[model samples]
Target: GGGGILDSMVEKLGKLQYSLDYDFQNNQLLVGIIQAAELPALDMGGTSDPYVKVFLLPDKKKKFETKVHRKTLNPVFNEQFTFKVPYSELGGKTLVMAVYDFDRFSKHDIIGEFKVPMNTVDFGHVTEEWRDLQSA
Candidate 1:
């Protein structure tokens, strides 16, 4: 069956899906740093210290970041962040995030990053989704 091929591929390859939710009534946003798999290692120890940072556009003045999980290629960060903003003001804004390998001595290594446009989502109600981490 054509659909059976999709099921088998899940055990081999998968996408990183984290919760980024927007509440229209509350005028708030919640970001969930869940977990990531199938990531490339960047440390000499064959593993990495990973952390995440997120921002809502037009305001680089404030940023949200997560604690670094040490010494693992696949790490779990179930932390959350909240922000309140006017729903009308949210249009045309983009949510951006970057994943990095935390470093104690030198510069931190960037693993990957992604950006999502807010206007593309219907803001009539609270929205929560698992989306692909954009390679671009």
Candidate 2:
């Protein structure tokens, strides 16, 4: 009875690994790459089509969207997209990276979302790592 209905929390939905480098040019421009893999399935189909959308959450005008890899949970997207952002504004530096399940006729579904704080990232090196996905 101590652990009530709402006491149980989700441990995790799934796991994924990705890599990118953060570099600052003149301490103003922030550059990074997109390489993602081994995402979880969100669709009813046996396989999933996954893609990424990276952007600053507060600054919602632009997003770095990668192409959809056909019918696979694991994909290499370092081939197509790298983002270059200049830190000219005073807006918050938290970034949102979204893995989405692609659809042809309907709205795409979100698989997971990760928030990366720019303050925590070490610039001037390629950062390769894994992270847990949190709900929106």
Candidate 3:
């Protein structure tokens, strides 16, 4: 009966809200990992210690992660990362946000991820709201 309750529940992931801004003078792209909401519970107490790892694709050299928030389904990161890239070359870059649940005893579990192609973003402006995290 105990295990059946969980099995009957539908699995649902959450959304991450972030922003992007590009600076022409310095040739930098700023990514703001604002917050995440409605995250799935992955811990024993129906909550999870969550954080976000972000980086630009194609290089995978520089990466950044936010601080871990203990026992939460939703966490507010409000963290910003910068990439030194020129606007002229932004067409080939993609921004990736990988959200994960931290486990003290073992490796962290990935919750979901979101990706944004630089060419599709409107530079010098921020996005409107939260984005759905995708499977895979």
Candidate 4:
């Protein structure tokens, strides 16, 4: 149930990929780059140009914009960028990264989206005794 809302959001976002790997050790949001990965052929000449946007929602009510962008063409881009989410503002809160494609001029029609939780330890390696759970 922890990520139930986020999982639901991903279904609605579609196209844009999501990862659950927020690295607390490094204290940054690290999203995978999908440059070499197979992406559905996009109509670049059309209105929607692909781009990624990261948002930090400390209260799950107000979203402060990080204004960071990541763009790619193919092969499952794995590049990551970091933003300083102040520690005082992180506890009991969530960080949201929404990836979308908007019209070049109008900036409308979000073609895709992805969401991940911030401020939580990477669930993939939470317990040392359950290290095998890291495979995900």
Look at candidate 1 and give me any clashing residue pairs: none
Give the alpha-carbon lDDT of every model.
0.71, 0.64, 0.86, 0.40
- Clashing residue pairs in all predictions, respectively, total 0, 0, 0, 16
Tens digit of lDDT per residue, candidate 4, span 97-133?
4444445567544444433444444544521111110
- Which ten contiguous residues of candidate 4 have the minimum total lDDT? 127-136
Cα-based RMSD of the predictions, in order? 5.7, 3.6, 4.9, 9.3
Model 2, 1-136: lDDT tens digits are 3577555664354445556554454344343434455566555756678887877757767787778888876676664344456644423477677878899999998877888776776666766676665565
Off by over 4 Å in 1: 1-15, 43-45, 124-136
The residue pairs that clash in candidate 3, if any, are: none
Better of 1 and 4 by TM-score: 1
Ranking by lDDT: 3, 1, 2, 4
Deviating ranges (above 4 Å) for candidate 4: 1-13, 18-26, 33-47, 59-76, 86-91, 119-136
